[PDB]
Symmetry: C3
């Protein structure tokens, strides 16, 4: 019996309707600037949608063995997180014209975080995961950093409005994101403390508040 | 016995010789503009070539079960279509200087179409495929649309020649492309109406007339 | 027993410390030009690092059968080479402002080389590999070429210093790179001449002298 069905039966709707919501509202008035934007942000919840639906249907659920059991690992998790994250980081650096340097970097720093996440997310040695967990977090903290001391531009010739619009998402990333290693850590694959049911939910409120909500928190603003 | 061998033994040659044909002819005279082009278009048939060869050799053929049989699904199909499609859409939007907005969008709209194609292209529930088929088509129709009402620029300061060169491919995409969901639909994995042999052929005439021919239909023109 | 452990236990350190070395030294003084650079080059050894670590731990080792045995094929090899190569080619074409034409081309020409490498790197017919080996090399020789007669710009309005800095890496790529088909050829999957132990080492001196060293051979210079 799969009782994660409901928390996973609810991330399709939310993410899915979130997309069906940005096109409708999506258009460009005088500067095909928001145009680049209005796009990205639709992609983020849309891509995810196939994933929540992909977990939801029972297709993204393997049964890897940690010397003592045979547990579930929704591999289709890192997949959705694989294409959304570099898209958000783009909504970011874009807004805050961020030298391509921190850009190519920004992403790769991302990429390598999820990938390794994946590796340590399927390994059959109860003691080889966690190490991979280090390198991943380790890396996370690198974008996170560059995101602070980093994207702190030289707000001089720009919209004396961005600031907030920026730091309000810049504060929603540092908080919302930093939660993943923490759950993944003790979830269904970390310590075996919190089992899937609750984790999986901990995971969707973490997602939505990160996408559906995110994009709004921005496109409503200039 | 594999009698799809011949229709699949012929897509290597066509696609393969099609490549060996664009480099030879490929060069740039006054504007490294066609340069960006002459490139893309070589990639399209070349990438494909490894794929027709990859199917052709018997390496891209799985045996997924639809509660009642055990049928073949050339997974190496969505692979070739995974990198060619975003390349063509580029030959397009390029030619028709198309705001990066419709661009990043164009592709992702593509991407998600093939990916999901893949998912519903390997699933073991005779009733979970088709749904995925919806989301894929559903999406197709989104680029298709933006391709019409969409790429209809403001032909003002440009080559009063593009138009045709454009709408002739723009008419070759809307027709040739829209055939895939229709075959995949009843092919060897849809309904089990048309078996592989014929499908596979339906599939290669669909491909070539889409690449070998395509690129020509363009680079011959200015 | 795995005696490749040491040669693979040493590529983590080298590549790993090589990264920990470019950030530290990595910064931008007057032109966020080196900025684009200082980035790429950190990625190259870093990405690799997870891979040497991924081989090193025993996670990237399959057991494919060549009609007569059951041999090892560190599939996690083409993975690291999948993202580093298009990054180096970028350190290159960048430095030598290289029309996007040769650029998009440069990479795809790369991409298809490793991919096919992979295909012929896992196939279970002792006689179908080598063919794939052809198409791969075949392709290699295409970037290699464009790298010579090709990137030979029109050194006119530029740093009368690049030249060397260029041809010294341009000479380190043509030599160091061209060795892979040659080892892969007779290694543990080609002819079965040189077994893993030595190959694997032949392979890491080939790597480092290609990355750790590479990047240095450049960023030290202007
Ligand atoms: C079978 O054996 P075994 O495997 O061993 O056991 C395992 C056992 O199945 C475990 O669970 P449980 O034991 O609890 O039983 C099962 C279940 C009983 O129900 C069955 C009905 C299910 C199928 C309906 C689910 C609805 C859903 C996930 C859609 C949510 C999307 C909407 C509409 C909101 C978006 C718009 C909004 C912003 C206005 O319970 C769990 C079911 C309940 C929690 C469902 C009701 C609440 C949810 C939150 C709203 C959906 C209601 C809709 C009808 C519309 C109204 C909303 C709005 C428009 C006003
Ligand atoms: C009954 O049980 P039992 O049988 O006993 O148990 C037995 C058990 O159930 C079954 O077997 P096994 O244990 O062997 O399972 C092994 C299984 C796991 O590997 C999955 C592949 C994952 C690990 C790789 C994806 C991430 C990645 C490539 C890391 C680096 C990515 C970066 C940094 C890019 C960003 C950089 C930026 C600058 C742009 O498959 C092994 C599969 C192999 C046999 C096949 C070949 C490998 C793949 C297909 C090639 C590489 C492709 C990548 C590009 C992936 C795409 C995403 C990527 C870009 C992030
Ligand atoms: C510089 O001055 P400034 O005033 O900024 O001037 C400029 C001018 O005012 C421009 O306005 P701005 O935009 O800055 O306004 C303000 C801004 C605030 O950000 C808030 C971010 C949201 C995500 C968080 C709200 C909670 C909060 C701030 C309280 C802190 C305490 C916590 C975290 C709880 C601890 C409890 C613990 C025990 C668990 O935005 C406001 C906009 C939002 C209303 C947007 C909507 C988001 C929703 C959540 C998602 C939508 C989709 C849902 C249906 C999916 C999920 C539902 C479900 C599963 C939960
Ligand atoms: C074995 O048991 P089982 O598995 O149970 O059965 C299963 C049973 O094998 C199923 O099939 P079938 O029963 O029919 O028998 C098998 C077969 C008999 O043949 C064997 C010869 C095969 C190997 C030759 C195939 C040729 C090919 C696919 C290349 C096409 C590329 C070219 C040259 C064109 C591009 C240039 C052009 C634009 C000028 O038949 C099927 C074979 C015939 C259909 C092949 C002949 C026609 C094709 C279209 C042209 C190739 C001819 C070349 C020699 C050059 C001439 C062209 C030009 C340059 C002037
Ligand atoms: C005897 O028979 P039996 O044993 O009983 O039957 C048992 C049977 O035969 C064997 O087992 P199973 O049923 O479990 O098979 C499950 C099998 C299928 O999954 C294949 C992976 C496919 C589904 C994923 C590719 C597409 C994708 C990621 C969708 C979204 C892509 C978008 C939207 C990008 C464009 C966006 C734009 C903005 C740039 O593998 C399951 C494999 C897992 C165990 C391993 C981990 C997953 C992978 C490797 C990580 C994700 C990588 C992706 C980036 C893929 C690359 C392409 C992508 C970019 C399009
Ligand atoms: C605005 O005015 P305009 O006049 O445009 O002025 C500007 C100036 O004239 C510039 O010229 P342009 O370019 O526009 O000229 C015209 C243009 C027309 O497009 C035609 C597209 C091709 C793909 C389709 C031809 C068929 C047709 C138009 C008839 C309609 C009826 C159908 C579809 C059949 C229904 C039957 C049903 C029962 C099945 O191009 C002409 C160029 C072509 C000759 C290019 C070559 C393509 C070939 C097919 C592929 C090459 C490789 C092959 C060896 C592989 C496959 C072979 C095999 C498997 C089939
Ligand atoms: C078990 O059964 P079975 O599977 O059948 O057999 C199979 C049988 O295990 C096969 O191998 P072998 O039979 O040979 O026995 C095994 C082994 C015995 O050792 C065990 C100790 C191992 C664990 C230590 C390895 C060290 C390593 C790979 C790190 C290198 C990185 C550094 C420090 C250099 C970077 C900085 C530099 C530029 C300053 O041997 C093989 C072990 C020896 C080759 C190791 C010593 C030399 C290496 C090159 C340097 C590392 C030394 C460090 C302590 C620091 C000093 C360097 C510097 C800072 C001054
Ligand atoms: C006990 O032993 P036994 O069981 O008897 O033996 C049985 C034995 O052990 C187990 O089974 P099998 O033999 O069937 O193994 C088959 C296995 C191998 O395939 C691995 C996938 C590799 C081959 C594909 C990666 C490379 C690629 C896509 C080539 C082209 C790339 C280019 C040119 C891009 C650059 C272009 C540029 C312009 C940007 O998996 C088969 C897996 C399938 C079932 C699942 C679906 C396929 C995948 C997931 C979708 C495609 C994703 C790609 C985008 C890959 C990512 C990297 C790429 C970008 C380079
Ligand atoms: C145009 O005039 P120019 O004079 O250029 O004026 C401009 C001004 O002079 C600017 O200076 P430039 O930069 O051009 O200076 C010169 C340049 C030379 O390039 C040399 C490249 C290195 C990679 C190769 C050195 C060997 C050589 C040239 C001899 C040839 C014979 C061979 C190949 C052996 C045959 C034997 C066979 C039997 C095996 O650079 C010098 C910089 C280097 C010192 C950089 C450091 C690289 C090291 C190797 C890697 C670092 C990390 C290691 C810890 C990892 C691996 C260790 C281990 C496993 C091996
Ligand atoms: C829309 C989805 C988002 C923003 C997902 C973000 C995910 C992370 C920041 C994940 C981090 C992880 C680690 C640092 C280590 C273990 C594995 C992960 C993927 C949970
Ligand atoms: C060179 C190859 C090309 C242009 C391939 C195009 C493929 C499609 C438009 C495929 C569409 C599909 C669906 C809409 C649903 C089912 C799966 C596909 C991939 C056949
Ligand atoms: C940092 C890693 C680098 C620069 C790796 C380069 C690898 C190659 C040039 C590999 C070439 C191959 C072939 C031409 C055929 C067989 C397979 C390969 C991948 C070894």
């Amino acid at each position: 019996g799969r009782p994660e069905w409901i928390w996973l039966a609810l991330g399709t709707a939310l993410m899915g309707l979130g997309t069906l919501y940005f096109l409708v509202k999506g258009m460009g008035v005088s500067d095909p600037d928001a145009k680049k934007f209005y796009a990205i942000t639709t992609l983020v919840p849309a891509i995810a949608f196939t994933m929540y639906l992909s977990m939801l249907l029972g297709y993204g659920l393997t049964m890897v063995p940690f010397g003592g059991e045979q547990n579930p690992i929704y591999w289709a998790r890192y997949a959705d997180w694989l294409f959304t994250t570099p898209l958000l980081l783009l909504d970011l650096a874009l807004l805050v014209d961020a030298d391509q340097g921190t850009i190519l970097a920004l992403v790769g720093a991302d990429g390598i975080m999820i990938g390794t996440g994946l590796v340590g997310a399927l390994t059959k040695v109860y003691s080889y995961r966690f190490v991979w967990w280090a390198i991943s977090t380790a890396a996370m903290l690198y974008i996170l950093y560059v995101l602070f001391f980093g994207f702190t531009s030289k707000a001089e010739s720009m919209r004396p409005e961005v600031a907030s619009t920026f730091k309000v998402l810049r504060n929603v990333t540092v908080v919302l994101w930093s939660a993943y290693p923490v759950v993944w850590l003790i979830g269904s694959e970390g310590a075996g403390i919190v089992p899937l049911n609750i984790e999986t939910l901990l995971f969707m409120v973490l997602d939505v508040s990160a996408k559906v909500g995110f994009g709004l928190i921005l496109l409503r603003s200039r």
